[PDB]
Amino acid sequence: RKRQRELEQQMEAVKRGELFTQQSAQYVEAARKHYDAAEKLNIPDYQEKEDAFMQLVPPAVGADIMRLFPEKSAALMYHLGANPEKARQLLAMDGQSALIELTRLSERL
Amino acid sequence: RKRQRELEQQMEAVKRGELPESLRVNPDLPPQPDINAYLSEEGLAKYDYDNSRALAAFNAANTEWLMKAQDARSNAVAEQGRKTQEFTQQSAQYVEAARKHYDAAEKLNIPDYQEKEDAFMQLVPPAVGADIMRLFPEKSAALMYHLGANPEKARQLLAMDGQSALIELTRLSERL
Amino acid sequence: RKRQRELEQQMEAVKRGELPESLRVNPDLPPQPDINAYLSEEGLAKYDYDNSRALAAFNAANTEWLMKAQDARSNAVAEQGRKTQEFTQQSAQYVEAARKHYDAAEKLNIPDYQEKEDAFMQLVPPAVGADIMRLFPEKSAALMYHLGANPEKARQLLAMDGQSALIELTRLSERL
Amino acid sequence: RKRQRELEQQMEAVKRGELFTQQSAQYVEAARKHYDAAEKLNIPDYQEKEDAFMQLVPPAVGADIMRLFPEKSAALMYHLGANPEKARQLLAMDGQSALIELTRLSERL
Amino acid sequence: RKRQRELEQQMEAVKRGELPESLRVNPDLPPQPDINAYLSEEGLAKYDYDNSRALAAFNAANTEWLMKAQDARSNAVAEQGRKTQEFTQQSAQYVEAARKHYDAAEKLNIPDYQEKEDAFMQLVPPAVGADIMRLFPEKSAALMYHLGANPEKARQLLAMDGQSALIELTRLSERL
Amino acid sequence: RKRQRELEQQMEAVKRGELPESLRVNPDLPPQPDINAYLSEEGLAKYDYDNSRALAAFNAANTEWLMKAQDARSNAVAEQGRKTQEFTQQSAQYVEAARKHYDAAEKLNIPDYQEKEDAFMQLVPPAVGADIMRLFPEKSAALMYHLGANPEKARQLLAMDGQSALIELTRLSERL
Amino acid sequence: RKRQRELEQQMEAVKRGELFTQQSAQYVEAARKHYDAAEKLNIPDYQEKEDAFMQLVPPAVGADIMRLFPEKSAALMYHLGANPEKARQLLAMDGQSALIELTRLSERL
Amino acid sequence: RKRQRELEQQMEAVKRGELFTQQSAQYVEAARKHYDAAEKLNIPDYQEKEDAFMQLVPPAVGADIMRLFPEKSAALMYHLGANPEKARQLLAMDGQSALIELTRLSERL
């Protein structure tokens, strides 16, 4: 709940005028549905995997996948952290093929 | 065919080494340490009121600037070679682009591909089309056909970024 | 044949690397910054009456002259290699020149090519003839024949520029 | 007539001593025969094509073609602006082949 | 065959780049201008009794020594490449040497070539034999045979220079 | 198989260029000549009591340190390339190591090779085993078998050096 | 006997404190058994061969073979000086294969 | 005799210390045997031919042939000046084939 609290603190500082804001607001809502989908995942070990994700990808690509797929995002990062070898190969590779594995993760559901 | 002919002519232009001046990577020489600011009487007052340490560390600064500018020019050569190699791989994937255009003319044979391709070129930037033909070579013709059948979808695609387009397209492809 | 023999002998002379001293590109070393003008008492009076900044910026000037003269000599090597490559491409297009002279002797067979070619060589500078044989290899013989049939046109061509002359060459060719 | 006026103003400033002048004078006369050849063309839509020409080629090559061919220059630029795809390909290419199309434009006349 | 095997093994040793330390061309760095001799009080007395011109021209001397030593090392690289190319052409002509030894074993078939070749190797320096096999490949076997038939002529050839010996070789060849 | 799988996986790790930081050869920059010790008043008293020769030879020392540090870094690159080439040749001889492990599994087929190989790995350092498999590839399995049949000989081999431990290996091989 | 005298002089200087000493002492004893094996060889022409050996190999490898094989060392160097072509090829080659010929020299005895 | 006098003057200046000298001395002796061979030729018209030779070849190649063939040099240059067409063709050609005609001149004698 602490990460939600700090994200909400940053966003309320943004809306208070402590200055590009519209997408951040959509990221607030997409994070709400993100943790909804995290409950939908219901494998309580995903916290270390998502910690590893934020520490290994830049915030930009994580934000992109966070906003793209509101209903499957938690499972997407959980299973790409399950196979982080492909995560680093896609750190070397262009994001199009990583996007393809994201789409196949959509394919299973 | 004429569009393919100009594409392949650009290809042999690239393969020989016709590299535009804009593509010439100019070395980013780091600034040299200043002369007056360091080795003036104020610098002497820093270093116990003597010209000695000023000349010492300025000779050292000369040397370090020499090595960092040398590394800058050697880099300039290095990413010039890297740019040459990325022209080579571009050229390769454009060879498969020309070959898949041959393949589309060989296999598709159903639609009015010429004018729909013209409309798609006129609509989207060439980079998006290049990515489409690189990742979806054989279906690119049918994809342009279905996009031409949907001009409303076409100017969504115009209004929005190339990568996204990828999927939704990829998607659209797997919807069909 | 003897003219072709001397042309091809010049060719093997070029291919081995017989490069005349006039073709040796001497490096254009930029002038070094002056010694007395910068680092004298007048320079000291510029820089708050001290030998300090004078020695500082003169060491800096030494360093920058070292790098610019180094870049000058490295360039001299670079355009020496460029000149070698342009000798190679010349040599190539002169190989097609000798081969098209073979082709003219093989195909034309109609005119008195030797003396008309001699007259054309005696009239125009060799550069114009080289450009003519490079761009219009097979028709060059008939072109010299028709020019010899028109001495008045011949000394117009003599009086006027090479690029300019060819037009004549070319629109005369498409008149025939 | 405005472009003629500004060219003549620049050239009379040059001849007044406001400083390479001999070729500029020959360019004055070659521009006179240029607009003579423009009347010889007599397709009144060439103004936008020649505007595009000056804005896409450097002044040097336009000057070269202007001085080379006094009697056909207007038609030369009109028809190379008709096909400006070859104009940009020759911006990429050496000027020798562009010169070849100039010569073929001479060939039609 | 074993002599041919060791010759060709030396060949693949050369082709990979096994270059002996004696063949490493050390750069000939020109001497730097002297420090005390130029920029002492005697030099000052030359230049109107002041340290000024001494430091000026010594910085200039530093710069010119930097460029001449740089040209020296760049040359060292240049004739190192030239030496590599002359190893390549040596290697080529030794490839024809091995191939003509094959040809001699194929064609001659008449004499006791092995021991006469051994005697010729034991007599003359290897450079003379290399030149003989380079210019007269096919007849070299019969030439060694006729020289072995003439030991008195053999030790004239030993006593006298390689170029001269050759004519001998050659006008003996055209005597036969 | 799993040991062979990890060996070959290390192989493809090496072939791509995964080079550990310990294998990064740091350049050995020679020390720069000292500043105070040379160009102080004691140095002036050496050179006839003047700052002149001190600045002269210190500029010279700057230049020579620049060239020796430059040669040091160019060397660092040179033995980095040499280290890359020795990784390539290791990789080659480890490719024959994996291939001879295939060959042993194909041909030997008699002994319990897995656990005897495990014991031999646990006993001797990996370098000795690497040399054994490099020089005696096919017999290495039977050699480990006979060593496992002789634990007393095994811990002699442990107690004593690899070149000799090997002797042991080889004259044991020719005893059998 | 002169080489024994100079080796013993160097070693007694070492033991006197004129400075890595333990292996030198073992080299004293291994040289004693070396010349024992030299008598075992009993072909009195080996002196020039061993002179050539010391002048063509570094002292390190000669010392290594001297210490490795106390009972066969004299014959080893006598027969590698008999074939010094292999000696120089092993100067070019790694010492492992030279060691293999040393082992085969052990094989004959 | 004047050319001998000037050559000897240059060589005695060289030996006096007015400075690569050993080959010049051998050239003195080879010139002595050169004019011995010139007497052996005994066709008194060779002076203009050798004047033409020195004025058409560089001194280096003339010196090389002078030193190579002490006994036949005069006839060599006399007959290559007889056919100076081959002399200029070999000015264009590499010296190896000129050397071949020198060898055939040796073949006649």
Residue numbers in the entry:
A (entry chain B), D (entry chain F), G (entry chain H), H (entry chain G): 70 to 88, 156 to 245
B (entry chain A), C (entry chain C), E (entry chain D), F (entry chain E): 70 to 245
Paper text:
When the density map of the portal and domes at a resolution of 15 Å was displayed at 1.9 times the standard deviation, the side view of the GOF nodules revealed that the outer dome contained three neighboring four-blade windmill-like structures. The four blades of each windmill-like structure in the outer dome were connected to the inner dome through a column, with one blade contributed by a side nodule. To confirm this notion, we performed local reconstruction of the windmill-like structure. The results indicated that each windmill-like structure comprised four gp8 subunits, constituting a gp8 tetramer. Each blade comprised a base dimer. The outermost part of each blade was not part of the gp8 tetramer but was instead contributed by the base domain of a neighboring gp8 subunit. The gp8 tetramer was stabilized through a four-helix bundle formed by the four-column domains. The tetramers interacted with other gp8 subunits in neighboring tetramers through electrostatic interactions between the base domains. Local reconstruction of the top region of the outer dome revealed that this region comprised gp8 tetramers. The SP tetramer primarily forms through interactions of the C-terminal region (residues 122–136) within the column domain; this explains why a recombinant SP fragment (residues 141–303) does not form tetramers.
Tailed double-stranded DNA (dsDNA) bacteriophages and their eukaryotic counterparts, such as herpesviruses, possess a dodecameric portal at a unique vertex of the capsid; this portal serves as a channel for DNA packaging during viral assembly and delivery. The portal interacts with multiple copies of a scaffolding protein (SP) to form a nucleation complex, which initiates the assembly of the major capsid protein (i.e., coat protein) and other minor proteins into a procapsid. The P22 procapsid consists of an icosahedral coat comprising 415 coat protein (gene product [gp] 5) subunits, a dodecameric ring comprising portal protein (gp1) subunits located at a unique capsid vertex, and an internal core comprising approximately 250–300 SP (gp8) subunits and 3 ejection proteins. In this study, we present the structure of the SP gp8 in complex with the dodecameric portal in the P22 procapsid at subnanometer resolution.
